Design a protein around this ligand. Structure first.
Ligand SMILES: NC(=O)c1ccc[n+]([C@@H]2O[C@H](COP(=O)([O-])OP(=O)(O)OC[C@H]3O[C@@H](n4cnc5c(N)ncnc54)[C@H](O)[C@@H]3O)[C@@H](O)[C@H]2O)c1
Ligand SMILES: NC(=O)c1ccc[n+]([C@@H]2O[C@H](COP(=O)([O-])OP(=O)(O)OC[C@H]3O[C@@H](n4cnc5c(N)ncnc54)[C@H](O)[C@@H]3O)[C@@H](O)[C@H]2O)c1
Ligand SMILES: COc1ccc(Cn2cnc3cc4c(cc32)CCCC4)cc1C
Ligand SMILES: COc1ccc(Cn2cnc3cc4c(cc32)CCCC4)cc1C
Ligand code: NA
Lengths: 259, 259
């Protein structure tokens, strides 16, 4: 496999629908040795789910906490002498941030929390993981969404947080490139995961995507996972600071024939 | 290999330094069955170059000619029942279009030629290859350069032609997506190929790229080749109308610390 022997930390695996589950399957297929994180309450659920990937460790990490991120790498360092990649598949904004008019709904605390968990946490993992990732053609990949680039209904504070995340990815690529670490993002089309479950007309966003995209379909977690896997391989060593859309071509069209 | 059994046409192989050479190496490694084109006088040279890939066909195609493009697919259709991918790795502008001030140097005929061979030829291959590529998760990849996006010294008419090529890729992605054909471009950093030989200061452009890029290196044909290979695989079926930079991160930075 094209990731044979590479040691990769995957955050954000919550259910078998999670994007991180597709990432895990693809990476396990390609021979990677995997470790996983979970937010406190979900310990049992995640442990059971990632057991199919023969994980080297399954460790708590709530990215609101500097201490938990520090302790993640301490514990990981007890099982691994070095780290090849970190996959960031984590996002959060308070429910009230999403849906409704952006200016009606946005709040100072909501904006702050969304940025903290969805964007800062990428830099946080880079800061604490860097010493393990030095000088081994290491990789980081974050998951993002086109709401970073364009104003969209409902996505609201999360769109702003994703724009912050994409800039964080570029500045991280610059910061870590001297150590041979490449740093990229995958901008996924919508996928019905647990993140979708708060969103009333989500299925309708899916329907629109399948209608308007060049490929006339919705993407799946394997299409996303396989791309994330490629971006942590030696094949991808000339790629950094890049956002690769895995969205059936949605990003490249405007209007379409069906108005 | 991740291209096992896929039938792929590679244009633009001219020397063992060609980007198309790195593409061929990567695709051959991944189990692709390959065919190659050459322009008029270079038949023997290209035959010699691609022998190591056990090609299914090596056929003339000067993309100035609609007839030659049509007859390419007639001949390919005699060895293959369907076609999985077309790799476009072709560019030309008359010498006087490059170097010097863009407005001083640009001419009506130079502009037209550059666009005909460097951009229109992508649509021309799509038009004649479409019937062979229908409904088999087929792929097209074009090679492009950041001079499409930004004004750069010397690149001149070629930069304009690459912008045309990138729009052509997007419109082709839209036009072919209904047939399941994904259509993308790889934007490579500078590489010392035959295309570079006419350019006076080329080494200095390489030096600049290695200094300012986050990864502090120049890319090679294998880094480009492996990415083109990925974009012709079933792993990439969520990706279309995309431009992927393989340039050590050059595209994501501005200014740098060394002015
Ligand atoms: N679902 C989509 O339509 C889609 C599209 C584009 C991008 N994305 C992105 O993909 C990523 C994964 O989302 P998903 O759709 O698989 O949903 P998901 O609900 O399965 O996963 C989101 C993950 O974020 C984690 N998380 C939230 N707060 C956290 C915290 N404080 N500390 C650590 N982890 C925390 C959750 O536990 C969960 O594992 C997110 O960045 C999301 O924005 C999703
Ligand atoms: N070398 C670089 O710095 C670099 C960087 C970015 C993009 N590219 C692009 O990569 C592609 C390959 O270029 P390369 O650097 O490997 O150089 P190269 O000289 O090896 O290949 C250019 C190819 O274009 C072909 N060509 C020219 N006119 C043609 C015609 N009329 N019909 C058919 N084929 C024709 C040539 O025969 C040759 O095989 C081009 O699109 C180029 O713009 C090169
Ligand atoms: C165009 O609107 C949308 C498009 C995609 C989505 C799906 N989605 C993508 N990233 C997300 C992050 C979060 C949620 C939903 C998310 C919810 C919980 C917090 C984090 C949602 C909307 C609303
Ligand atoms: C910023 O300047 C440059 C940056 C990269 C290059 C290399 N290069 C990339 N695509 C090309 C196409 C052609 C030439 C050179 C090319 C020459 C022959 C015709 C086709 C050249 C310049 C000048
Ligand atoms: Na062989």
């Amino acid at each position: 496999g094209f990731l044979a022997g590479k040691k990769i930390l995957i955050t954000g695996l919550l259910s078998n629908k999670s994007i991180a589950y597709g990432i895990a399957k693809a990476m396990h297929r390609e021979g990677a040795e995997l470790a996983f994180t979970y937010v406190g309450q979900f310990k049992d659920r995640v442990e059971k789910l990632c057991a199919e990937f023969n994980p080297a460790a399954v460790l708590p990490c709530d990215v609101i906490s500097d201490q938990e991120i520090k302790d993640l790498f301490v514990e990981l360092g007890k099982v691994w002498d070095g780290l090849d990649a970190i996959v960031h598949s984590i996002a959060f904004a308070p429910r009230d941030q999403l849906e409704g008019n952006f200016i009606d709904c946005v709040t100072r605390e909501g904006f702050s929390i969304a940025h903290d968990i969805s964007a800062y946490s990428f830099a946080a993992l880079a800061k604490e993981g860097r010493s393990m990732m030095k000088n081994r053609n290491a990789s980081m990949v974050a998951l993002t969404y086109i709401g970073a680039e364009k104003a969209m209904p409902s996505y609201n504070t999360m769109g702003v947080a994703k724009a912050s995340l994409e800039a964080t990815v570029r500045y991280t690529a610059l910061a870590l490139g001297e150590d041979g670490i490449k740093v990229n993002a995958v901008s996924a089309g919508p996928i019905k995961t647990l993140a979708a479950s708060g969103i009333s007309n989500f299925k309708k966003m899916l329907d629109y995507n399948a209608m308007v995209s060049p490929l006339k379909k919705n993407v799946d977690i394997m299409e996303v996972g396989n791309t994330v896997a490629f971006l942590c391989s030696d094949m991808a060593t000339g790629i950094t600071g890049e956002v690769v859309h895995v969205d059936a071509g949605y990003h490249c069209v405007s209007m379409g024939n069906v108005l």
